[PDB]
Amino acid sequence: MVEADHPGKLFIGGLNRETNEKMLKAVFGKHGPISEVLLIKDRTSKSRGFAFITFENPADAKNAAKDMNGKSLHGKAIKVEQAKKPSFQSGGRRRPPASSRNRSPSGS
RNA sequence: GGACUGUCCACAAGACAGUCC
C-alpha cells in the first residue's frame, strides 16, 4: 500500500497549549507502538502545540487513525490525519527525482 | 545556537518585534 505514501508519520491536531507528550503516546499509542514523538512549536519556545508521531509501521499509524479520528480527551476533540510535508514539492506526494553521484553542494 | 519578553496565530512541521549570553 502506497496510496498516501508510507512514512508511518501521523498528525494530531489540538494540543491547545494545554495537553502534551503524555497525550501523544496516549492517543496515538491507543492502537500502535510509536518510535518517535514530536510536538511543534517556534523559537524552541515562542510556544504553540501541534503533534507529529512516527510509528514502527504505517499500518499502526492507520490503526491509531481509524481508532481515534475525532475522539475527545483534553477538554477538546482531537483531529487525526496522515502527516504531509511542511512545504510543496510536486503535489500530494514528494515523488523525488532519480540520482546516484551528482555534484556535491560545495566548491571554490 | 541557548534563555527571556511583547505580538499574530495557534490542528502541517511557524514566524515577526525587543532584550540578555
Side-chain angles (χ1 to χ4, degrees), chain A residues 3-66:
Chain A
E3 287 61 39
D5 214 332
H6 67 86
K9 200 171 186 85
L10 210 87
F11 171 27
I12 263 47
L15 304 313
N16 187 256
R17 303 81 52 213
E18 173 177 51
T19 203
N20 295 285
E21 196 192 270
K22 181 140 270 146
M23 108 59 123
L24 272 82
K25 293 241 79 192
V27 166
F28 295 89
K30 285 247 181 206
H31 267 16
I34 297 81
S35 196
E36 302 186 304
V37 189
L38 194 67
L39 35 91
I40 303 291
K41 308 195 167 279
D42 38 331
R43 179 244 91 176
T44 209
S45 197
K46 269 164 178 77
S47 208
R48 75 195 278 148
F50 72 104
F52 286 104
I53 254 170
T54 317
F55 287 94
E56 303 185 15
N57 316 274
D60 310 311
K62 190 173 66 177
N63 211 354
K66 183 177 66 175

